[PDB]
């Protein structure tokens, strides 16, 4: 029920050999959208403040609980037009990296 324009590993429009923009159908469009949503950060969407991932306040800064970051990421994964629910979320926080893993559910 969704659709979007394919982009490469960098966040730019990717063109095929024929030089035609391709409109991705469902499923794959959902993957593109969720990646972009998790990468979008808070405080950037003009005309909609308080949307995005609060990285600098909830993850990078020293924190007490870390539950707030989980809630923020769960909300960011949601609000996609097609995503229904979240099955898993890990938040490894092992070693130096802040590991994150998730699997979501779509209608199709």
Partner 1 sequence: MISQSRYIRIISGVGAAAPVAGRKLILRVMTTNNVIPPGIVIEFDNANAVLSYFGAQSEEYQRAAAYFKFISKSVNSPSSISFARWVNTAIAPMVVGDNLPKTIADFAGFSAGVLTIMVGAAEQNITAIDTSAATSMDNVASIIQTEIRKNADPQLAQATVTWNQNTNQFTLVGATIGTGVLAVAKSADPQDMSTALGWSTSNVVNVAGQSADLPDAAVAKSTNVSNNFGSFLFAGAPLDNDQIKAVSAWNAAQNNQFIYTVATSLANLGTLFTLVNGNAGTALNVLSATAANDFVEQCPSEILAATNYDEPGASQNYMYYQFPGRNITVSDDTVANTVDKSRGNYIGVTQANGQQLAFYQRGILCGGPTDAVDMNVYANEIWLKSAIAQALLDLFLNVNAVPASSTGEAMTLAVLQPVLDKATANGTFTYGKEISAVQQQYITQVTGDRRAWRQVQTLGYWINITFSSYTNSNTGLTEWKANYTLIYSKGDAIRFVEGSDVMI
Partner 2 sequence: LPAYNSDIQQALKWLHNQAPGITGLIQRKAQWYDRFSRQFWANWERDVFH
Partner 3 sequence: MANYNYIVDTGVIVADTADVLSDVEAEFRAALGANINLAASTPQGSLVAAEAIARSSVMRNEARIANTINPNVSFGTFLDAICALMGIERGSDLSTFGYGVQVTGRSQTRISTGSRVQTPAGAIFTVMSDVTIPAGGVATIDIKSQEYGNIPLPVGNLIIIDGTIGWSGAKVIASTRVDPGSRQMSDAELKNARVNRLAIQGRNSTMAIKAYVSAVPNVTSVNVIENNTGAVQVVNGVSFTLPYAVWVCVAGNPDKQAVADALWAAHNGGTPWDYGATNNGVPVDGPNGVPVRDPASGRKYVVKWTTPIMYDG
50 binds, among partner 2, partner 1, partner 3, none (CB under 5 to 8 A by kind): none
Are 9 and 37 within 8 A, CB to CB? no
CA torsion 40-45-49-50 (nearest 10°) is: -10
In the numeric block, which tokens belong to residue 100? 């994150």
DSSP 8-state assignment for residue 27: T
- Shortest Cβ distance from residue 15 to partner 1 (Å)? 19
Using CB under 8 A as the binding criterion, the count of chain residues that bind partner 1 stands at: 33
50 binds partner 1 (CB under 8 A): no
Min dist. Cβ of residue 73 to partner 2 (A): 16
Between residues 56 and 66, which has the closer beta carbon with respect to partner 2? Answer: 56
**Cβ atoms of 106 and 91 closer than 8 Å:** no
DSSP annotation of 66 reads S
Where in 65-104 is the site for partner 1 (CB under 8 A)?
Answer: 77, 92-94, 96-104
17 binding partner 1? (CB under 8 A): no
């Amino acid at each position: 029920s969704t659709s979007t324009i394919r982009t490469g590993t960098n966040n730019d429009i990717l063109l095929d050999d024929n030089g035609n923009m391709v409109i991705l159908r469902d499923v794959e469009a959902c993957a593109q959208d969720v990646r972009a949503a998790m990468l979008m950060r808070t405080g950037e969407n003009i005309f909609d403040v308080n949307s995005g991932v609060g990285y600098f306040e909830y993850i990078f800064s020293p924190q007490k609980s870390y539950d707030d970051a989980r809630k923020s990421i769960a909300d960011a994964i949601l609000s996609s037009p097609d995503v229904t629910g979240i099955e898993q979320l890990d938040i490894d926080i092992t070693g130096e990296v802040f590991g994150v893993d998730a699997k979501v559910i779509t209608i199709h």
